[PDB]
Amino acid sequence: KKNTMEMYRVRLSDKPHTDDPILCLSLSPASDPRLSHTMLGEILNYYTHWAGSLKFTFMFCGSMMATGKLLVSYAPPGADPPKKRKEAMLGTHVIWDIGLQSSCTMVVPWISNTTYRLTIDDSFTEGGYISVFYQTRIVVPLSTPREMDILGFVSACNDFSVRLLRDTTHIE
Amino acid sequence: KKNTMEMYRVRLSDKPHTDDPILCLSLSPASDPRLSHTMLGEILNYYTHWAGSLKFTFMFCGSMMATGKLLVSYAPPGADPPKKRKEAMLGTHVIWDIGLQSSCTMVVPWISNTTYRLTIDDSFTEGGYISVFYQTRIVVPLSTPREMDILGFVSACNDFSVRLLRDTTHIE
Amino acid sequence: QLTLGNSTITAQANSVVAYGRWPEYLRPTEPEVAACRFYTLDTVSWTKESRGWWWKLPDALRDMGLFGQNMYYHYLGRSGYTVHVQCNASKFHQGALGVFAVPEMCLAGTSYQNANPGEKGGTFTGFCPVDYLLGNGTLLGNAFVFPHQIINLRTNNCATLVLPYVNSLSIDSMVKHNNWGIAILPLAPLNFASESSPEIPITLTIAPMCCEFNGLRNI
Amino acid sequence: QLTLGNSTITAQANSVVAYGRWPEYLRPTEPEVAACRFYTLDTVSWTKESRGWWWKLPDALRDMGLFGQNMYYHYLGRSGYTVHVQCNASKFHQGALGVFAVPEMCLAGTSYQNANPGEKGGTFTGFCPVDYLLGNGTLLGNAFVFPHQIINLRTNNCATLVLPYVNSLSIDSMVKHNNWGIAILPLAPLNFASESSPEIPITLTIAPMCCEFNGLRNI
Amino acid sequence: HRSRSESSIESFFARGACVTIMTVDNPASTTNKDKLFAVWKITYKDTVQLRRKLEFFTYSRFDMELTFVVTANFTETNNGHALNQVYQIMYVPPGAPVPEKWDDYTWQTSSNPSIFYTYGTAPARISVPYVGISNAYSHFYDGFSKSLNDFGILAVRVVNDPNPTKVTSKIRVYLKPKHIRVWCPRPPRAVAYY
Amino acid sequence: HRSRSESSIESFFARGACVTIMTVDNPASTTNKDKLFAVWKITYKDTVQLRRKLEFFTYSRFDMELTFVVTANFTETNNGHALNQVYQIMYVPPGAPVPEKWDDYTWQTSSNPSIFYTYGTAPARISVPYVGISNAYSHFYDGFSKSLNDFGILAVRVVNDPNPTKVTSKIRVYLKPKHIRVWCPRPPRAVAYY
């Protein structure tokens, strides 16, 4: 799927639903391979220190008739990636009723001891996670297709900031 | 005729009049061979950028008895040199009745996308044309000579300007 | 020097407003300078043998750019004119022209290709309309009832006719009906001193006034 | 129902004014209704295999009557736009389009016949610009920097972009330089319930705003 | 309390970086080969870093701040004690004739500014203002003839007369775009495309 | 909005351009030939560019801003390590005696200003004021004796004593007319006439 337009969208099928995340995403931009190309990994790959709050918008590209619920959970830094629906529900979550809403927004807050967290440090791998869980299987009428798509958008918030340009763009 | 005083004047005979311009003149000073020696081609051969409106005065060195009409047409830049009287008449023209006037003045306006058009660029060859057409053959009484003369004068207007001295005057 | 848009003719015999009525807007569109130019038709060389020349309006201006593409791509159209004839001659040429603005000029010696020549105009004869009767079966002497002017080459050399819109219908299709007609006839034949130029040009200059077109035909 | 001259489209997803700047007159001419129509280009049938469609402005409107005959018979020309995409789909169709107004859209996979298709538009590919990189060598994900909109077929089916005149020169020749570029890309492929119509149309509707042309070329 | 005034356009771009290494040499008295005057057309499309940083945007207006670091070396064991080289560094503005010989008039022409540099002193320095016909540089052009903005040329030679030493020299050029404005952001190109 | 303040007289003329290359040399201790003091009469009628630009007008009042670029080279393989040459650059005003020897009194005379230049430092520089009898230079004179305005002379030599090295030198002179006024415009001469 890489190198094509199939990489950007996650398929929400209607079969196993084995109580495991649809998608778990690390909240360390400029270090996460799947989050270091989104114009935050392209600006934080020129800097060394970053300090701000991100913003994840999940859009549901399905039919108006499709109904159900999803669970967007945010494990703060120093925690572990929740691996079951109940644990994610016990944390900081938002229930996203796709039936009556089409996009769910989650603003990851800026929590850290320092005023600026190093962008690419392999020691700090507990920067927090954002995960999506099947609260309820999807219900669709008639022959409406089972397979659906969900898209993610990652943006900086109005209080973002970076420091100490690096400019590691070599060629050889 | 070159290298002499015969170059500066154009003869308006009274024979073929084959609906083709008496004289067609490109409006790109400092690049046109017949317009790059008139003290505008001598000042714009020291500069690189020019931006202004020119001014062409055509004087008719004939007898008071000679009567007729001429047609001074201005094809704006991006057009093509009009090659018949009707097409020139459909454009931006002035009818010059030599009988009751002896000099016709035409101020080519400054039209261009940029604020300054390069002086000598061989890519831009559609800078506009000014042409003279026989609106009506010349009528003279008695044995008045058929051959006559017309002189042209090219001057800058009060809003002319140049930029970026070049000074290409070599010797070797 | 006139001020109508792109075209300007140097004109120094005063205007003869036909029927005492100035062309006025119907009480549509307003072309402003789109068609109200001075369309200087081609010149015709008056000689010692020429018998006349007849143009028809608006058929004459059927290829004159914006006016031609507005009268042909509309359905209803009305417009006066300011026909202006100039005969550039020296002091040693003698003659006289009559310019007649013949409304509903039916030159019945009639195919549409013969009675609507266009910019070329035409030529009377002694399609060969008879000059003697003006082509209308009526003696030329009476032709002076038509709103006219005389260009005598010892007092003037230009004649201006301000033709209003004269038609039974307040607005008519310009591609089928020719409201007016300009007939130029030599009243006194041209003559000149020896060795002078033997053919003096005549230039018409039509300036549609208060033109209004209604309808449209795409393209 | 809009009010722009002859053409009116019935439009019930709000307008996304690109860069927060409304198209404004240069501080020329004023075509008014001469070219400020709603030129509804031909529809393109979105299917389960289509990868994208790219149009370029003003090259798209090179045959649209008065605008096409004004941008080609002038020398300088500037104009914003009000591109308007509508994807008529029922409740049982699912998908999502991204409409990107790509300034200086250089789809370098370049002959002038390949980068200026016109009303036909074009088609990305997986002349075959690569959809994955948007044809610009850059990942499609970042493409959202361009002033864009998203047409998700469960919340809306129309998207309006108000493109101002963006060009290094305050006024440029419309026949050589393509200021903008409209790229429509399926973010989520079309899908539908069985036996439903398998190809939903998409109609663009370009409305030149504040157009100004300077110069002229006769004819 | 944070600032955000380090992601500004000028802060992001106003960083000097070598753009070329122009090689010249003082011809030996044997005249084996004439002066190797080095001519280089000012263009940012040879440095990956500056080009990539400039391709985030469509149009830009940046003033250049060229600077020259001059180094030289004898190619032979014998010293020869060549007196300190004097380098002429001529900035041929956009459109002016391009030098084609080490004795062409363009070196002596009045229009082209020039700097004279004695090997050893502080590095030379000029500041080419915003020199362009349009109202902003363009890195992506969607039009056709009938990008490639011309900034000028730099031509460097050794004024000194031939000396039997073969003193080779390599002028490093550092370009720091200052007073830079940028419009119309675009997706960043991958680092493999250059 | 345009300026027009680039076609001004000073902007058109106030451009430095080499006017001569005066050759001197430090005599060898063998005294094969005495010092080649270089004497050059200041005249603009040897540079095509400046002369042509000045022939657009009849009368002019321009102050000179001479500048000297000094270069040198050993003529022999052996270095000899000649200590940095010291050049005396004497501006002989108009009418003063013209030096005829490398030891003439004119070098030591009080009237003639002189500059002492150690090979290596920043280029020398003077500014000859408007030095003329009349109230404006004249490039075209319609009279007869009973043009050729005298600006002065420049005489350059090497103060150092003879050393067995044969250190040849070539002083390039750059003239930038400043505070220049011009009257009575004339047709420009063709570029083949010079």
Numbering used by the authors:
A (entry chain C), B (entry chain C): 61 to 232
C (entry chain B), D (entry chain B): 84 to 95, 98 to 112, 122 to 203, 212 to 228, 243 to 335
E (entry chain A), F (entry chain A): 69 to 214, 233 to 280
Which passages does the manuscript contain on this structure?
PV, an enterovirus within the Picornaviridae family, is a positive-sense single-stranded RNA virus with a 7500 nucleotides genome enclosed within a non-enveloped icosahedral protein capsid of ~30 nm diameter. PV particles display two distinct antigenic structures, the native D antigen (D Ag) associated with mature infectious virus and the non-native C antigen (C Ag), characteristic of non-infectious particles. Virus-like particles (VLPs) that lack a viral genome represent a safer potential vaccine, although they require particle stabilization. Using our previously established genetic techniques to stabilize the structural capsid proteins, we demonstrate production of poliovirus VLPs of all three serotypes, from four different recombinant expression systems.
The rsVLPs were found in the D Ag conformation in all serotypes and expression systems, except for PV1-SC6b produced via MVA in mammalian cells. Only a C Ag particle could be reconstructed from PV1-SC6b expressed via MVA and few D Ag particles were observed in the data. In contrast, the same rsVLPs from yeast assembled significant numbers of D particles (1320 picked particles were D and 2428 were C antigenic form, a ratio of 1:1.8). The C Ag particles for PV1-SC6b (yeast and MVA) exhibited distinctive holes at their 2-fold symmetry axes compared with the D Ag particle of the same rsVLP from yeast, in line with observations of the expanded state induced in PV virions. In the case of the expanded C Ag structures observed for PV1-SC6b produced in yeast and mammalian cells, the VP1 pocket was in a collapsed state compared to that of D Ag particles; filled by sidechain residues Ile-157, Tyr-159 and Phe-237 of VP1 and consequently empty of any observable cryoEM density indicating bound lipid.
